[PDB]
Amino acid sequence: PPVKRSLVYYLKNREVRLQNETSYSRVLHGYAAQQLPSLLKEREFHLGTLNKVFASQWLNHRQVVCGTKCNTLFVVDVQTSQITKIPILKDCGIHAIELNPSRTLLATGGDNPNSLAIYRLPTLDPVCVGDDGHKDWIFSIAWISDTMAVSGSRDGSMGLWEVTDDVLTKSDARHNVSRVPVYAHITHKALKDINCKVRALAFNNKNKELGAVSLDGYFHLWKAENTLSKLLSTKLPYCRENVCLAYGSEWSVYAVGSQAHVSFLDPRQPSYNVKSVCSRERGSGIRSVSFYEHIITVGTGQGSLLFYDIRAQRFLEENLKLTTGKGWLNHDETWRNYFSDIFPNAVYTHCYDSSGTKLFVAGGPLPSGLHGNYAGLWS
Amino acid sequence: SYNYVVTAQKPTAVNGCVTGHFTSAEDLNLLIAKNTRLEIYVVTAEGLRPVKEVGMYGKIAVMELFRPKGESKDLLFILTAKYNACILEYKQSGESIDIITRAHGNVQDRIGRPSETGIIGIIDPECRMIGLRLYDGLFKVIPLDRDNKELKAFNIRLEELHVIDVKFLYGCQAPTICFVYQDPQGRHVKTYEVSLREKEFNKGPWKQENVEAEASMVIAVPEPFGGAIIIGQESITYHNGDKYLAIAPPIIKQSTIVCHNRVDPNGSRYLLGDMEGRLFMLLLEKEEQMDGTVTLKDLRVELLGETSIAECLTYLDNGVVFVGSRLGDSQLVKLNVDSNEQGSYVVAMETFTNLGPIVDMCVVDLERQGQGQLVTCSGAFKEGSLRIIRNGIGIHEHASIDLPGIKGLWPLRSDPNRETDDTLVLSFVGQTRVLMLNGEEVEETELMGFVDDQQTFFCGNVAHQQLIQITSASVRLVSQEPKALVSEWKEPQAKNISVASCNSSQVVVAVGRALYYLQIHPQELRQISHTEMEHEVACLDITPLGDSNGLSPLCAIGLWTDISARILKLPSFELLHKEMLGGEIIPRSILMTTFESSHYLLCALGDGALFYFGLNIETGLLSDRKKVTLGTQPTVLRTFRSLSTTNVFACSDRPTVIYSSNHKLVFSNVNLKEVNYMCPLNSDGYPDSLALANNSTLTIGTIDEIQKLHIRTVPLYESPRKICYQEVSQCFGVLSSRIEVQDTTALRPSASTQALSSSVSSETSFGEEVEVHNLLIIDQHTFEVLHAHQFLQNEYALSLVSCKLGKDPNTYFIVGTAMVYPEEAEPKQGRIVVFQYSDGKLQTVAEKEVKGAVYSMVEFNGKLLASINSTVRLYEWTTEKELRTECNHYNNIMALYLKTKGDFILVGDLMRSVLLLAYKPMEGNFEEIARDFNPNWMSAVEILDDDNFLGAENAFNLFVCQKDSAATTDEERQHLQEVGLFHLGEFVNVFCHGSLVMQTPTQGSVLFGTVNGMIGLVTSLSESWYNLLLDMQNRLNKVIKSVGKIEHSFWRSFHTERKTEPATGFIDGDLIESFLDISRPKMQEVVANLQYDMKREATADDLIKVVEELTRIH
Amino acid sequence: REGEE
């Protein structure tokens, strides 16, 4: 038979409890997803003088954490407009924040931009030190299981690290025998080496693969069923400025960014099914990308979010496009030298909500010589 | 804001029943769980003697019985819907009955997520361990033991995510488990074997098969067979590893089996039964072998019959089958060994009323008495009905005569062999009539011995096998045979009598001012005592009370110039007490009556003010003076026997019963338009009945139960959606749909086809099932379908309003409809149609072709507010009688609800919370005042007042959000705060402004109707009241107990999937009222050190009389 | 000018 697909059946069955079931839980969202883009409104936040927001992740319905160029790690409430600053972990600030699939651990950079750090959610207590497996930066921290994590780097090292059950136990025991922060090192169970820098990652969660990206323009898929085992590689379609890549967990396509295009890549399929949608916003660079049910949110440098529809192959709505505010700026000596004759805050990060209604954008100014925060919550 | 919520009518729908020896070792019990409500019945040879009912702090989700080894009776396992496992027993000591909990404890896994076929709860047959499937991918296990007081679980990671059903196989050494699950390859069955020491799934006895596509509902056959039966949709299968049997009956492919029960305790016969009410029987053919092995032979099924849309069957004994239903009523049908009509071994035996699901409701007052009746929609698919709820006391209309201008009515027995009635005696000014009662029949006549040309004031059956009747000029005592005037007394002064009464051996008459007492002797009246009263007498009563054989020496009177009542002692008429009533108009009727052996007197005035007093017949003294007002015309206070209880009626223009409830006298405006006089009745066709002479007629009927609410099922035989009302046309508009099978042809004669008149407004593969929609103009007196209109094909109709528009004096009906297709997510079509119902024939005025799905309409001050898909729109009713668009408003995901109050509008959304608007009339456009920034999924909105707003979320919660006028910038004057959070427990469908009680702590009343047929009431409060009652609350939660030791504050806490916080600014009316029905020594603990008012500390009786004022609201 | 990695 044809699919029983209509919102009215759900509406009227819901009233009787008879078959309002969860075969609809995927149409309600396919509908809300194309509805929201048209009815979002900014609400600025006042951070102060922090440099540039690089990482952001939701912790609750209300608290989102952010990491900056001045390697601050701060939790902002989205209701009360409250910034709280937390420690940092010893052994160009923060560049990537992720939460283990169980939402219990938090794997971000530390006092060393070449080491790592591990906080235990939902209480943020510091747990581990950064390890030595990377002498260069950490530019991506993906989670592959409840305790194994894979860390890209600006040298090329792809060191699998993994929080052990033993450090789990002496971490739920080290905060009882004491209350002062106590840490614990880990060894990189692997240090597999590979314009040879592991910038951005992804994670498919059925084939247990880790199709990464390297800024020279090279995709590198390294399956991790339980441990890393490199599988394949490929020169990506566009060459310049490939810094963002995500995977649509139910569309079997990788969305990867570029200078002025966005590419849909099927890995186990060859390079003649590569579609690069043009943004035409020439001069920004797609600094972030994310998947809602069938809707790709692109976050660029000129300060504007754009929306694409994987199914109708075209953009939403003249294409709907938000625009980030002004925020804050610093008037340093380099502001006087080369950046006084003119800022379009560039959205480096954006994330939706567990309840799928409120979006959170953050960023700063695009020229590297500048210094200015910005962060805004769009519902 | 500080609100108050309390339930008018507890849930009715039934979502699970079980049976077994709970209450004792041999008493076969039945146990039903309504929603949060558990009911324990004994089963007897003829019915269901109810034994107990208790309330849970949680929506029952799994209920099971089991007898562990070493225990005589059974134990009961209950799992609420917030994961509160508990294990109950049943104590009994004389009449002290209570439900002890032997083990309890939450079993929610800290972080998981719910399952896609809800909770499942099973028990092995050897009573070793409970298995629960709360969340996907896992299988929680509670090892039964003695050292497991805290129910202590542990998971087992099933490799199968999408389980569909599971059971605990029979006859196996260590616990086995057979279940059916889905997979990218299809649907399979598989058995594991749990290891309670290694905590893991060993491979189990037989193999993974390949099962029919849409299977479900596996069964576990008992010992002599063992194995499993899997009931898909188009086939039934038996599996035992080696064997395999598959029968595909031709019948059951019509609908889908959803329940079952084991009739015989060894698996021979099984009850089944699908969606649309039918009922089958499954047979297991035994083929026992030579070496002792009892095996199976074959499977066959046969159709028993029909019943309600059943949801949890049960077999007790002797052919008695309990049917339990959720979309209709719940029968008690009985099984015969042989068909009668066209083949049906089932004939009903009883029926229990079921309101849910209340899909709509509309409170009205039909006599303009301002009391309140509550027509609602109900049920579904073949059980859709209209109920008519109303507080009060019931008076059916079984007959009526045209008898206006009546002055008196009584019962009389013409045959001295009949203890039941065969005479109804009537009075008129200057004449007397009689009414021969033959069964339910009443016929005008004259009863010889009764005057035809003089007015009478009383009559009754008395001692010495005779009746009496007092006339204008005499007292006519008449033998019952041959009914001729056998004795007559007269007044010495030859003055015309005006008021009079009599009893078994005593008579009291009042002529002028003189009160005469007359003695009843064998066919003889003797003159003994009489007195001269100061002022004229209006009333005189010698009704004997209680258990005496028609003798009472008290006589109550009321005065005409000195407005008051008095009491007297016969024979001397000696004045015992003089009580000043007051008011403005003279008293007319007085009455004394028994009330739980307590004597109670009531004297009514002409202005409708009635003063009621406790009586001491030993001293004739009057006490506990209190007052009531009912109406404006004279009143008639007459005694009645019925329901084994004797009480008073005040006949007025808003007539009422004064009857009793827990030693407290409760009043109820009775289901009568306007009554002048009354006669209680005991005919052989009218047992414990009454005939009521009104302004124009005498309505003969019999009482309903004197309990508070009285339903009136109006079957429709389709599914009703909306209801409206049009008082200027004296009807109701209702929308309905019936599921006419496409081939298209219907399936039952329905109230939309059995229509007095009818009309029709102006992907196609067979075997489908489409729904067809109609507008029925139900009448309002005889509730019959005066008209039915049919919409286009495919055209759902979602919205109805009856309203006056613009510069037009006609009220209309207006509908909003949507061309629903099966493969479209959003309706891109719709209509809004306005037609009027005149000359009994309803005709189309105009129509407007919208481009959305009109989920709502209201009348905004002579304009039309229409919520189409995602955009609110506001429309004006022009003079060429068309609608012209005034102003749009976008910015909504899906507009679904609407309210207004003055110039404000309260939209409610599919997934975001409420949103306020306002209509700026200067330029004519919408100004979005505020909104709310949590993502709630809404079901119903309401404008509690001009600032607060009230909403209901589909996670079963209530919230109150108010415009924060205490803001400064124009950013915090665009958020709505949140003052109220409550976990109701139920999924509200509709709010309505009204109240079902005769017209102040509370300052409002909204009614809401849930899906489990509850009826609840929400009303605001005052901060002093709130802060008193909430402290009283937290004091209550320390002495009261809970079935299952659950914590009040845990249950009520605003709970959803993401957040969870305590309840803010509500009061639990149920708990507060249950303060009353407890023991005084335990009322002494709660009262101490309170905040009564100024601040001080009240006492016990203060807290008594501080919440009775809270029951008068519902 | 730019160079924000």
Numbering used by the authors:
A (entry chain B): 40 to 130, 141 to 243, 252 to 374, 390 to 414, 417 to 453
B (entry chain A): 2 to 744, 749 to 767, 779 to 1015, 1022 to 1115, 1120 to 1140
C (entry chain C): 310 to 314
Q: What do the authors say?
A:
Damaged DNA-binding protein-1 (DDB1)- and CUL4-associated factor 12 (DCAF12) serves as the substrate recognition component within the Cullin4–RING E3 ligase (CRL4) complex, capable of identifying C-terminal double-glutamic acid degrons to promote the degradation of specific substrates through the ubiquitin proteasome system. Damaged DNA-binding protein-1 (DDB1)- and CUL4-associated factor 12 (DCAF12) is part of the CUL4 E3 ligase complex, which utilizes DDB1 as the adaptor protein linking Cullin4 to the substrate recognition module. DCAF12 protein is a member of the WD40-repeat (WDR) family and shares the characteristic β-propeller/donut-shaped fold. Melanoma-associated antigen 3 (MAGEA3) and T-complex protein 1 subunit epsilon (CCT5) proteins have been identified as cellular targets of DCAF12.
To structurally characterize the DDB1–DCAF12 interaction with MAGEA3, we generated the 3.17 Å cryo-EM structure of the DDB1–DCAF12–MAGEA3 complex. The structure confirms the seven-bladed β-propeller fold of DCAF12 (residues 79–453), characteristic of the WDR domain. The interaction with MAGEA3 is driven by the DCAF12 WDR domain, wherein the C-terminal degron residues of MAGEA3 interact with the DCAF12 central pocket. Interestingly, although the MAGEA3 protein was co-expressed and co-purified as a 212-amino acid construct, only the last five C-terminal residues (REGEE) were observed in our cryo-EM map, suggesting that MAGEA3 interacts with DCAF12 solely through its C-terminal disordered degron end. A closer look into the DCAF12–MAGEA3 interaction site reveals that the C-terminal Glu313 and Glu314 residues of MAGEA3 are anchored to the DCAF12 central pocket, while the N-terminal portion extends toward a small loop (residues 438–447) positioned above the central pocket. The central pocket of DCAF12 has two distinct patches of positively charged residues that play a crucial role in substrate recognition and binding. Notably, Arg256 and Arg344 residues enhance substrate binding by establishing interactions with the Glu314 backbone of MAGEA3. The binding of MAGEA3 Glu314 to DCAF12 is further stabilized by salt bridges with Arg203 and His144 residues. On the other hand, Lys91 and Lys108 residues interact with Glu313 of MAGEA3 through a combination of hydrogen bonds and salt bridges. Our cryo-EM structure also highlights the conserved binding mode between DCAF12 and DDB1, with the N-terminal region of DCAF12 making interactions with DDB1-BPC and the WDR domain of DCAF12 interacting with DDB1-BPA and DDB1-BPC.
